[PDB]
Design a protein around this ligand. Structure first.
Ligand SMILES: CC(C)(COP(=O)(O)OP(=O)(O)OC[C@H]1O[C@@H](n2cnc3c(N)ncnc32)[C@H](O)[C@@H]1OP(=O)(O)O)[C@@H](O)C(=O)NCCC(=O)NCCS
Ligand SMILES: CCNC(=N)NC(=O)Nc1c(CC)cccc1CC
Ligand SMILES: CCNC(=N)NC(=O)Nc1c(CC)cccc1CC
Ligand SMILES: [Mg+2]
Ligand SMILES: [Mg+2]
Ligand SMILES: [Mg+2]
Length: 221
């Protein structure tokens, strides 16, 4: 799988690269997409099937994944996880809450960002440092964005608060083999959480493979 390259029972994952015919949403999920265009219906159904395949590995019966007030997925009792969908990719990573405090994942096409988007998602220090820490010709702007998204998705279930693109400063390293590596997101705002210690540093991994960027953060419980 692509997502295994960015991950460290207590943790499980599943991914698909298309929308298989014959998948349906669970009844509890169906209203959430009753009025949605086909592309949205399909990604929603497929990514939630991935989540249930992952939850099944952790011993959890098939269950609906509803959405909270800020769109965040609602996991079965005792579980945490993250979802992502982009062109050519649907993925889920889930964890047992006793061992895994939070998960955030993201996938994007490995393309340059559209003009004007980089300034909206980066800090000036990231634009200055990432060219020095990443292999030439990779789309470090898109990889940075992918890491910002994983950072938010791991942050929000623990804080239930906004995190802006300027509120996390992300430093990157590259592995010797050149298409994977580590990142560290440092939170620049108050990181108080609903329980447990505050969020200040979140360590993740990135990977470029088959035209996709994958990023993931798994915070130990
Ligand atoms: O954007 P991406 O495609 O990368 O990920 C979308 C997923 O992020 C999840 N998400 C949305 N808001 C979120 C939040 N505030 N915190 C964590 N995860 C969130 C959702 O599961 C969403 O997919 P869904 O609408 O099909 O449930
Ligand atoms: C066809 C889509 N084209 C885009 N340019 N979409 C964005 O810019 N969205 C966005 C916004 C909302 C305007 C605010 C901050 C940062 C971003 C980038 C994720
Ligand atoms: C480091 C901080 N990163 C974020 N705050 N990222 C988001 O807000 N991303 C997002 C956007 C971007 C404008 C639109 C719709 C839904 C989502 C959440 C998956
Ligand atoms: Mg088993
Ligand atoms: Mg998506
Ligand atoms: Mg995303």
């Amino acid at each position: 799988t692509l997502v295994a390259s960015v991950l460290p029972e207590d943790l499980a994952y599943a991914e698909l690269y298309s929308d298989p015919p014959g998948l349906t949403p669970l009844p509890e999920e169906a209203p959430l997409i009753a009025r949605s265009v086909a592309k949205r219906r399909n990604e929603f159904i497929t990514v939630r099937h991935c989540a249930r395949i992952a939850l099944d590995q952790l011993g959890v019966p098939p269950a609906p994944i509803l959405k909270g007030d800020k769109g965040e997925p609602c996991w079965p009792d005792g579980m945490v996880g993250s979802l992502t969908h982009c062109a050519g990719y649907r993925g889920a990573v889930v964890g047992r809450r006793d061992a895994v405090r939070s998960v955030g994942i993201d996938a994007e096409p490995h393309d340059v960002l559209p003009n004007g988007v980089l300034d909206a998602i980066s800090l000036p220090a990231e634009r200055a440092d990432m060219p020095r820490t990443m292999p030439a010709a990779l789309h470090w702007d898109r990889i940075l964005f992918c890491a910002k998204e994983a950072t938010y998705k791991a942050w929000f279930p623990l804080t239930k608060r906004w995190l802006g693109f300027e509120d996390a400063h992300i430093t990157f390293e590259t592995d010797s083999t050149g298409w994977t590596g580590r990142f560290v997101s440092r939170i620049l705002i108050d990181g108080s959480t609903l329980s447990g210690p505050p969020l200040t540093t979140l360590r993740g991994r990135w990977s470029v493979e088959r035209g996709l960027v994958l990023t993931a953060i798994v915070l130990a419980g």
